[PDB]
Amino acid sequence: ALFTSLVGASGLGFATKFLSNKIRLKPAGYYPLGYVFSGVAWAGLGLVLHNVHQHSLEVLEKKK
Amino acid sequence: ELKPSSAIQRGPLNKGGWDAPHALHNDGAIDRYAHWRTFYQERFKYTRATGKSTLIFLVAFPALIGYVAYQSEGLFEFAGKRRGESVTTR
Amino acid sequence: FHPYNTLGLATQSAMVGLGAGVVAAAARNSLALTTFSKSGGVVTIFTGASIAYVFTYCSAANLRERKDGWNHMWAGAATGAVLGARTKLVPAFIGWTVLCGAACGLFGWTGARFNADRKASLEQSPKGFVQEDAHQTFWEVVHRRPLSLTVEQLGEGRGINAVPIATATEAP
Amino acid sequence: MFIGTIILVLSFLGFVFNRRNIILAFICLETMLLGINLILLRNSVLFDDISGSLFAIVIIILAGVESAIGLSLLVSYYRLRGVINS
Amino acid sequence: TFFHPKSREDILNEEAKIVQALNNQRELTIKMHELKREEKDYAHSYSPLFSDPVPQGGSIGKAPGSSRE
Amino acid sequence: MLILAIISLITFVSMSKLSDNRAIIRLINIYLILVLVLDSFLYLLFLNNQTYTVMGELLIFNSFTFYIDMLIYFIMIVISSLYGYNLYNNNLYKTLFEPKKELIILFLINILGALLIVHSNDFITLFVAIELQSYSIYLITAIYNSSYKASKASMLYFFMGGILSILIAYSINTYYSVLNSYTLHSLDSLIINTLDLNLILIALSLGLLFKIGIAPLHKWLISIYENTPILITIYISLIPKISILSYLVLSNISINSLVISILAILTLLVGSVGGLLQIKIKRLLAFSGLTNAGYMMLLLLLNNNEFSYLYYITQYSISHLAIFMIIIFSIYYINYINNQYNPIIYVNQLKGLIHDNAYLVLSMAIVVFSFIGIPPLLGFFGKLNILMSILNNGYYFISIVLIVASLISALYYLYLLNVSIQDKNNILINSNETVSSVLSYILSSLIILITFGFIYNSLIIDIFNVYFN
Amino acid sequence: NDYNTIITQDWFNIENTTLLTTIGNVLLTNNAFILLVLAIVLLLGIIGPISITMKHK
Amino acid sequence: STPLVKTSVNYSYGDYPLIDADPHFKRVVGYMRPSDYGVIGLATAALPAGICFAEWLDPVKGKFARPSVKFLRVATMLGFAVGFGAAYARSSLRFFGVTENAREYKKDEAQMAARKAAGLEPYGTSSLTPELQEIAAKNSAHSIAGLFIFPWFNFVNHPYHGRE
Ligand SMILES: CCCCCCCCCCC(CCCCCCCCCC)(CO[C@H]1O[C@@H](CO)[C@H](O[C@@H]2O[C@@H](CO)[C@H](O)[C@@H](O)[C@@H]2O)[C@@H](O)[C@@H]1O)CO[C@H]1O[C@@H](CO)[C@H](O[C@@H]2O[C@@H](CO)[C@H](O)[C@@H](O)[C@@H]2O)[C@@H](O)[C@H]1O
């Protein structure tokens, strides 16, 4: 499901932001707008991967 | 001229906790005996006795059990064997 | 199996080992008539390893009339004996013997080759499920094997019988 | 094939067994490239083929730039130490 | 009364569907493995446009008779 | 884009002052990001494994080289960020990490050389690209000329690279003399059966492989890696490995080679065993690189190695970048800076890092256990694919040796974590200083990739089946 | 390699094309890419020595 | 304008019909869609916006300062270059029949028919000899694949366009 992929990729973005805060010796919610930013960016990458994969499946099926 | 940042303030690592009264009266002789027994592997050497025990337990005993177990494989069947019948299959 | 000519092959191995030890000695010299004085006996190392390995390998292969990893195990044992004699200690001699023998036995078991035997490999072999009633080859798989093959390979007993029990013990 | 091969091998042995100087090392590099190129050009002629000579020209140019960069590296190395004791 | 397991037939059907998907994957897997080892056309594998493998050499001293098929 | 960047950058760096170095490098970082994102759609050309010969049959373009190209851009972006941004704003770090004026141009030119090595369809292009990369990498080694060790390193590198380049040129010319050709495309199964090219092709492979430092010619490269500035070592230890290995994988000129088999075995053994007694961080990492180069060398003995090699090279690039970045970050908590080119040198200098930065040690643990190959980290799947390939092709003894070498190298991989989770007496109390946001985010992204890449494995294989079949 | 090669004539070449002209022809048309990459290599041969032998500012 | 070598005819690089295997620079820029100009504009804005945001995230000298005008001018220049490269690539990919190309296909059919009506060559007349035309074709064919590495274009009016 596309929605599930976007949620998952956004979760990866949140994980990256949280790990970045902790690596800076900062509180987990140090700059809460960064969570939104990183989640949006990683959701974009997840969407790109999803579209490429769907196109690949389409091509594989069309040769039948 | 290369020195860590003055911005850093370093304090002690204290582990915290409540120092309990010391309920064991350590015996130095027992501790040394325990340490010797615990790290015996660091000082093991191959001699006549040690080699003898090695060649017994790691070689001779496994060979005996292997001969028994491969010689006797499938040899016996006991379930409900009656008089006159052979309990051996070969 | 037709025999290895142990004498000849061992002689060629002696020659190769002597040359290799010579090359190692020349290198050793360059990196450090004194070349053999300050050799460290490397010429002897090479010569003895060569003669031991080749002679024991051919000897064992000829005696057993087989070619497999066990011959390499024996040959590695001999080579390790040679290399561990240099320690002049019985435990180290035994350790070199047994461990070099084990390592070379593993080597001979895998094929006694560093690269691959391409024709026997899975990528170049018949694989997948076999057809109607064909004999099983090494890499192929079935859904059912013939019971006679089971009885011959595994052996009779321990629940391996020619006929299923219930069939055999059926009354009429 | 003969002159080029021998220049290559003798320059290689000069390079390896150099225990005299680093300039000998530079020179062995250059002369190796020379021998490679001579073999190449003889083969070009024997085949009446232009690809051999084209690669010879490219080697010439690259050996030029390699010499330039190598001497610059040697100078930068010297700037710190004042002397090349090899 | 509190035990409400799924029916035996439903369990068998669901596992059979899973195994069918698994066998489909095995077949696709073996298929791709075979197709990768088949050989492609020169256009697909080397050059789509200019799909002639045959060279034409130099054109200055073009000698009648040098062409050979 | 790369040529245009090089030209513009030469103009600007000529006309800019020494204080503008970091701003210029940020500019190029963003430019490369923009190219990577806007021009990515050219993948579509490679659908069905369509191959294109370009520039009059000098360059070859397929999905494989497109992927290697994208990977090289990603690596360049990460590496340029380390120079374009300050970890900390104190005087010490201005002294520790300052970019030279011409460093960025050298980086871009070496990247161009690597891309031309990857795409090379003809031996003349191969040789010119090899020499371009070799010269640029000599200069990158030598650009920090205040360091005695860096200058000594650049000179040793010049000489060893020159000899290997002469071996390569000799191999190319022998191939010409036998076949009157400069292309491997002229080779066919009939030709390989008819003629014994084994000696020539193995000499060419060996000349290329000794340039990335496979045993028994390793030590000169490990010494160079040890003696260069740390931010230089992060680059010179990676890009040449990628380019040379990718070219060799794409060319497939040593299939079932007995000599490559023996040398790959030897490289595994030396990389695993020799790194055990190391006490310096960068020598430990260089022996790591040697063992991993062995793992990749194994893939040169077989056909259809594209998936395993791409997966392995990608995960290795990520792990290598991440471990170097972690070592870099851990510099802020050491109490002794050894010198201005290599601030931290000995593994024991990390002792007790978990008490200073717990999550830095968490990241360190993750990357180390990726290197060891603990599932479900990326390293495990990389090794799994490699084992699948080599066992499918009957390399049984080499598989046993690979097992043994991974076991042995786990010891000096865990040495780092071991000293890192030990305890230090003087524990950071507080600090106002913030690590730079950008590099911390990049390090975190690498860590999250290593940790959660495996969820995309099946999607990746599905994509692969349509672009490489 | 003791035998002698037969040198034969033919008349198919009407131009005055020598080795230099043919090298120019192939280098500037069939291999223009090699030429431009050599331009980059010479550019390196300029930038590098300046970068390491000169101390800016 | 007679071809010296044989080429594939209407080869499928993708799911869509082939318009031109090696389109001329003027055609590729001439067939560009408003979306491609949007791409150019987006790159031109993005690159200096990128440098400014990067300065925001991690200031070069501790204290935020807007990047100087020299760098911003640089930024616009290089961003336009990236945008134009991307847009050219998109249009060429349309020409190969890799992306959707109905509009471009129709426009090409009309233009070719008009040129044939005028008696002109379908791909124009070249100031080069045919051998140099084949060499220029073999140098420019599919050169867009290396957009990441080097820019190369077709500026030569050759006949090897892969059509009938
Ligand atoms: C977990 C511990 C790991 C250690 C054990 C691994 C060692 C593997 C040994 C097993 C194995 C590879 C199996 C690999 C399977 C997966 C690998 C496992 C993981 C890899 C780590 C290597 O078998 C080797 O055994 C050596 C002897 O030990 C031989 O040594 C050499 O001997 C002399 C040369 O002739 C020289 O004198 C000298 O060169 C050495 O002396 C080698 O020649 C031989 O290849 C067997 O492979 C082969 O087996 C044969 C018949 O079995 C198969 O063909 C069959 O043909 C008919 C009959 O032939 C059958 O009718 C037919 O049905 C079947 O088609 C082959 O298709 C092939 O498959």
Ligand SMILES: CCCCC/C=C/C/C=C\CCCCCCCC(=O)O[C@H](COC(=O)CCCCCCCCCCCCCCC)COP(=O)([O-])OCC[N+](C)(C)C
């Ligand atoms: C909006 C544009 C942004 C795209 C920028 C890409 C930058 C690449 C930078 C670094 C490489 C990093 C990881 C590459 C991913 C492989 C893509 C692919 O699928 O690999 C396949 C080939 O599989 C292979 O051989 C094996 C690849 C080995 C990957 C090892 C890591 C696996 C775990 C990574 C998980 C992904 C993170 C997602 C988190 C939400 C090539 O796919 P393709 O050639 O068709 O191009 C993709 C279409 N594209 C151009 C639009 C992006």
